[PDB]
């Protein structure tokens, strides 16, 4: 009966998503034209849920 939070998922939102470079397997990486990775929580500020 020990309910303990193990963490929370990280959500990343880049200013220019169109500029993300396409890796394989539906994965993207940050580049010069995509801006810097903005690390934030979910449901906070401009992030989603």
């Amino acid at each position: 009966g020990e309910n303990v939070t193990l963490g929370r998922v990280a959500l990343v939102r880049v200013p220019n998503e169109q500029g993300l470079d396409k890796k394989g397997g539906t994965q993207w990486d940050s580049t010069q034209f995509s801006g810097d990775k903005i690390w934030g929580e979910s449901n906070k500020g401009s992030f989603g849920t």
């Binding site: 200013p15 220019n16 801006g35």
Partner: protein, 53 residues
Amino acid sequence: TLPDGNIGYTRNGQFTLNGEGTLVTSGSGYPVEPEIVIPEDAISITVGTDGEV
């Protein structure tokens, strides 16, 4: 805004953002006059009929 400094005029409307959030064209990336910088706290973008972003 052209790289040399002059202003170019276009009819194509496919725009996007660069790493700093300024509204640029989806081709060579020329910034749109006047500069429209989308803040990182925005959850949606709306452009009015009168051009008020």
